[PDB]
Structure formats: C-alpha cells, structure tokens
C-alpha cells in the first residue's frame, strides 16, 4: 500500500528543478518515479514548485472535477509544469514519452486536506 497523498507526491511533485532541462526529462522521470514498472503510465504531469505551494491549492479556487465531483481546486497562479505523454510507438518494457514544458494553472482533487489526484492543467 501507499496513501493517495503519498502516491500524488510520487507521481506529480518535482520540487528539485525549476523546469524540464531536456526532451529526455519524461523518459527519466517516469522511470525513476516507478511509473513504468509493470506498464507504461500513458499520461502524467510533474509540478516544479514546492510541496507547500502545491498542497496550498486545496484552499484556493473550488471547481468541478472532470468526473463531476466537487472536491477539485484550481491554483490561482500559473506554475511551472512538465506534461509527459507516451509516444505512439512506445511499447512496455521500453516506455517512451514526449516532454512538454509550460507555465499553467493546475487542478487537483483534494481530500482529508491535501491533493490526492491531478485532474488537469489549464
């Protein structure tokens, strides 16, 4: 087991770098965060901000989640984020990702009161 709060941190936090430094960021990070262990996770976003800044989103703008639940929150500010998406030819065990770096608002689901899912960036 792993708590949902802990899994969110593992899948979505990268407070160590201000941005992706190269187009290989996703290949490296998806591997090192255990997101390619038994299958390639198709889509994943890393947030280049402090843990405190991301947890704080849970007390910012309340919005609907994609699934219609009401426990999502949108960050007031843009944050540095890296979107990772599995390439068309990627085949487990050799997972391959496109890296996109941008400054976007994030939307997280919160429960309990901390983030437990990444809903989207805007």
UniProtKB/Swiss-Prot annotation:
Q: What class of enzyme is it?
A: lyase
Q: Which residues of the full protein are shown?
A: 27 to 150 of 150
Q: Name one GO biological process term.
A: defense response to Gram-positive bacterium
The protein depicted here goes by the name Ribonuclease pancreatic
Instruction: Give all cystine bridges in this chain.
Output: 26-84, 40-95, 58-110, 65-72
Which family does the record claim for this protein? Belongs to the pancreatic ribonuclease family.
Principal location: secreted
Q: Which gene encodes it?
A: RNASE1
EC assignment: the record states 4.6.1.18
